[PDB]
């Protein structure tokens, strides 16, 4: 008989994610787990049916039964709305299940032996989470056309004197200025998020700021995150042999790179600055603060390049490891949740399946070019799509043999 | 007789760099090249004994003879104020610099055709550049205390005019708010040493901001970036093949994937230094990254090696052992700096000699003769032989040997 594996929400999307995350329930995961699945179709087609109310759906779903697997999806633009002559360009279904869920993005990039890293002596990966914006959520930015002042004030509600903060007296010339807030609730749940992950993972977590020189801005995120690991995780981390310790960035980025990895990294960056492989090694989790509820995902797109060269029959090497691990990570999730020993194993045996297939040397053509430069692959050297999911599926019926004796 | 080289500012340093710093003059420059040397020591005991008042003298001879190269130096932190029994926790030397000279950083990683890359396909390094803010310039950050209205207000001088924006209105809790501002000056100022800098290296000019996030504020840079290149550089750029053109970060990021490098990038952030860099932190080695101080004015220039003391190494020399320290980011640092000596001063034999060194070094690292840091690079270090590199004094006296071959061609 197949495991019993319970709950999970599964939300399927466009392009070439579509076409995989189909294969993988087909090979990887429905001949040996039985799942009470809350299927939700997020393709681009059946939201614009829908008037987007299936995203809405698929969200709600994820906050009642905890856990959510979710495929890549076709965020419209103006060319998206006329090749599927949309409704309305619709918003980001990501964008809409993290405005209904709250919580920190999570991203691991799944690491093999054979495979360059920026870092060789990695050997674990580096999960790094932003505090990012609850999309709704903006700066004030405008021009100063001219000479005069800019200053920024605080009106209290309960009806203290009004403070006002010169921000710059522009005496020649104009310029820009903004203003930006965080509140302390979206703080404490990024800190809930970093330390439910790092208990997750048993790793220790660091948090970096520039809190040098945003002393109170920066020192208010440093602040939270020392009075709630102090008051309601330091037993639980020191239990499991892990830490907490904030880090300014300057001296926390030399660190990871004489580092072995294991680690959770929370990162504030200072605002305003812009921030940004092989993509198809990159995992996501929204993590919210509750500890209760993820939502996995592959951190990249629908791969629309070579969903293009599969409708004309041309062959394809689409890397699925990422899909995978959101497949795992969903998996491993609900077995905690259940104290599920049976799904436990699987999601473990399937991450080992899939990191010793291209170990062994068994790739797609993305990580084919990692080892053997671009220039310089050629055609034996990797599998198409559909062979490294056949090999995929023949080496976890091997392990899973094993296993049993 | 040597080549007469004019005024340099020269800034000796600390722990390993100082001994390095030692070699390239004696090695390198001195046997070579007579200069009118303004020099001063930024050794950590020499800045503590004059109440950092050398640091202050050293950044006023750069404003008056343009041209500074810069040994690394400690930054005074609690175990360093208790090993050195420092009077006081003493600023960042390249703080006290930048802040009185102002200006735009530029940072390049040399290649070495030998050597592995972030991306295999880059041929010509990558230029990035961050502009050099004043301790002036700081956002007006604040707590929150509790529930209430944020607002942001400009007043113009004559006190017409004035437009208030609502920031947040705080309705359940505090959390924290801040204001930020850029003058039109420092942009200009960014968007000019940029370009030259561009022109000055015949490469292209890329330009980086969240002008789709920050429609006003990033706006400001793209528009006034635009305008420049339009009125002051456009006929120069397409006369040398180059071109300027503003990308999300996004874009840029994809298209330097796909690029053979030889591009300068201009990056509109605050936090721009190579300590913050995750890239330039844990790629290849830190002795193969510049970096170069470029002043408003186009006639002032800072350089130095973007890394620090190397105090690691440092220890092991202390104790005897043997040590592989690369030179060549140090080395660098005075080759930019007699190029641009030679440059104001219009003084070719000059030009040619820091040209011929900077050749010299990468041909040397070319050739297989290279420090432990870049044997590492090319064969892992778990197995990486003694035969497989050189250690810092041999290293110096391989370059040593090829600059006197180099130079005696050249002659012939
Ligand atoms: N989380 C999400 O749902 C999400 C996230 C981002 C974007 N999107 C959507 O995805 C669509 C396409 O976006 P995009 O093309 O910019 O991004 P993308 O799908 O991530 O693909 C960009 C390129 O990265 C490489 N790549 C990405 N995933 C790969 C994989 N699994 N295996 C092999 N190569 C892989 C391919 O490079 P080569 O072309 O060199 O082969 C591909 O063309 C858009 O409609 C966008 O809205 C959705
Ligand atoms: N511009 C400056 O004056 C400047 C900049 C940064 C830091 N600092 C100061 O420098 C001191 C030491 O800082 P740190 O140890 O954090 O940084 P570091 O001097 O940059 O050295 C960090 C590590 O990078 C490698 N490395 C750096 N430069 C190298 C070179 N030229 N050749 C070979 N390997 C090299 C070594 O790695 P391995 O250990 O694996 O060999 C070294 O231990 C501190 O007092 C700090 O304040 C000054
Ligand atoms: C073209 C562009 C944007 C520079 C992107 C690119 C190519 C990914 C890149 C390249 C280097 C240069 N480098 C290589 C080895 N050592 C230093 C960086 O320092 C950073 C830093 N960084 C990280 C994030 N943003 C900037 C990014």
Same mark, same amino acid.
């Given at each position: 008989k197949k495991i019993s594996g319970g709950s999970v929400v599964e939300m399927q999307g466009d392009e070439m994610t579509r076409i995989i995350w189909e294969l993988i329930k087909e090979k990887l995961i429905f001949p040996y787990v039985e799942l009470d699945?809350?299927?939700?179709?997020? #393709? =681009? @087609?059946?939201?614009?049916?829908?008037?987007?109310?299936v995203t809405k759906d698929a969200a709600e779903a994820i906050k009642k039964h905890n856990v959510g697997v979710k495929c890549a999806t076709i965020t419209p633009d103006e060319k998206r709305v006329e090749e599927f002559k949309l409704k309305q360009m619709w918003k980001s279904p990501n964008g809409t299940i993290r405005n209904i869920l709250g919580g920190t993005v999570f991203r691991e990039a799944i690491i093999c032996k054979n495979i360059p890293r920026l870092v060789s002596g990695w050997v674990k990966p580096i999960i790094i989470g932003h505090h990012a914006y609850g999309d709704q959520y903006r700066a004030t930015d405008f021009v100063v056309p001219g000479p005069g002042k800019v200053e920024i004030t605080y009106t209290p509600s309960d009806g203290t004197q009004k403070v006002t903060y010169l921000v710059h007296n522009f005496e020649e010339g104009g310029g820009v200025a903004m203003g930006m807030y965080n509140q302390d609730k979206s703080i404490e749940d990024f800190a809930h998020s970093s330390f439910q992950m790092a208990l997750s993972k048993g790793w220790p977590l660091y948090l970096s700021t520039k809190n040098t020189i945003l002393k109170k801005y920066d020192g208010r995120f440093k602040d939270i995150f020392q009075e709630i690991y102090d008051k309601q995780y330091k037993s639980q981390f020191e239990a499991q042999k892990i830490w907490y310790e904030h880090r300014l960035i300057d001296d926390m980025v030399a660190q990871a790179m004489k580092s072995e990895g294991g680690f959770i990294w929370a990162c %504030?960056?200072?605002?305003?600055?812009? !921030?940004? #492989?092989?993509?198809? /090694? /990159?995992?996501?989790?929204?993590?919210?603060?509750?500890? %209760?509820?993820?939502?996995?995902?592959?951190?990249?797109?629908?791969?629309?390049?070579?969903?293009? *060269?599969? !409708?004309?029959? !041309? @062959?394809?090497?689409?890397?699925? =490891? &990422?899909? =995978?691990?959101?497949?795992?990570? #969903?998996? &491993?999730?609900?077995?905690?949740?259940?104290?599920?020993?049976?799904?436990?194993?699987?999601?473990?045996?399937? @991450?080992?399946?899939?990191?010793?297939?291209?170990?062994? #040397?068994? *790739?797609?053509?993305?990580?084919? &070019?990692? =080892?053997?430069?671009?220039?310089?692959?050629?055609?034996?050297?990797?599998?198409?799509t559909f062979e490294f999911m056949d090999k995929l599926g023949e080496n976890l019926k091997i392990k899973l043999a094993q296993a049993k004796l």
């Open positions: 699945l809350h299927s939700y179709d997020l #393709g =681009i @087609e059946n939201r614009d049916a829908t008037n987007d109310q %504030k960056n200072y605002d305003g600055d812009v !921030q940004s #492989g092989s993509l198809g /090694m /990159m995992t996501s989790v929204l993590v919210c603060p509750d500890g %209760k509820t993820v939502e996995a995902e592959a951190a990249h797109g629908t791969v629309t390049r070579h969903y293009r *060269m599969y !409708q004309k029959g !041309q @062959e394809t090497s689409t890397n699925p =490891i &990422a899909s =995978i691990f959101a497949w795992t990570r #969903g998996l &491993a999730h609900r077995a905690k949740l259940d104290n599920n020993k049976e799904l436990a194993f699987f999601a473990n045996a399937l @991450e080992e399946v899939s990191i010793e297939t291209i170990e062994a #040397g068994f *790739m797609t053509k993305d990580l084919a &070019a990692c =080892i053997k430069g671009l220039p310089n692959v050629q055609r034996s050297d990797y599998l198409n």
